Amino acid sequence: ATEVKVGMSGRYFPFTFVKQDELQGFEVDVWNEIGKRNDYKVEFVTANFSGLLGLLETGRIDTISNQITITDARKAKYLFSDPYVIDGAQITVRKGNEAIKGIDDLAGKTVAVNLGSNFEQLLRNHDKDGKINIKTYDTGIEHDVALGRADAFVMDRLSALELIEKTGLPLQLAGSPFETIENAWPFVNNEKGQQLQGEVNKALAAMRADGTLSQIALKWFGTDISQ
């Protein structure tokens, strides 16, 4: 059997998170089904998001299942599979705050972003004159905004929506998503990476056909986020 290592953070509800001392979520269920279909011994390695892409290049993991958005720079540095989730980058503020209607309102504000994430680069590209006070983190991002240490943060709409409705955090969506994001699994451009890529695309396409991918998405979001 082929050993495959899947990097994640364990702090990305409901994609990858811990509850009752169990590492679970959307990314966990998906790669267990992939491992059934390709004779993989899947091994989950939890690490902060800022170092997941580093672990991938060094070779201590084989891929990452953590909503890795495909970017122009990441295309040149890694291989990617077919996108399995499509969404948009969302600004989210504290509940009751109407002083921030979108990304153009961040001038002079403090916006939290995960370090090394596509949301940081997008935010720095949307900061032409240094108006925004970008604060980068790996944990406690949505908590600083709900408490007041940061004015807003930028993630995907899906995860923020579940924190607002399911979890119940005192947060609200700030406007409409300003950038579509296509999320796929990155691979190292080597023999095993090319081998995993082609075999994962065949499993991903096979899961979309029989509805298994939709079953996983409905369990973790109530909505088929694969569509």
Q: Which residues bind Cl ion (CB under 5 A)?
A: 69, 117-118
CB 67, min distance to K ion, A: 5
Among 67, 90, 92, 212, binds K ion (CB under 5 A): 67
| Residue 103, both tokens | 């990304």
CB 210, min distance to K ion, A: 27
CB 171, min distance to K ion, A: 18
Among 16, 63, 65, 69, binds K ion (CB under 5 A): 69
Smaller CB distance to Cl ion: residue 24 or 133? 133
Please name the residues in contact with 46: beta carbons below 8 A apart, sequence gap of 6 or more: 7, 8, 9, 10, 16, 23
63 is in the binding site of which of K ion, Cl ion, none (Cβ under 5 to 8 A by kind)? none
Smaller CB distance to K ion: residue 67 or 212? 67
Whole-number Å distance between alpha carbons of 204 and 83? 9
Smaller CB distance to K ion: residue 122 or 132? 122
Q: Cβ atoms within 10 A of the Cβ of 145, count? A: 24
Give me the sign of the Cα torsion angle 13, 146, 96, 91: negative
Please name the residues in contact with 147: beta carbons below 8 A apart, sequence gap of 6 or more: none
Q: Which residues bind K ion (CB under 5 A)?
A: 67, 69
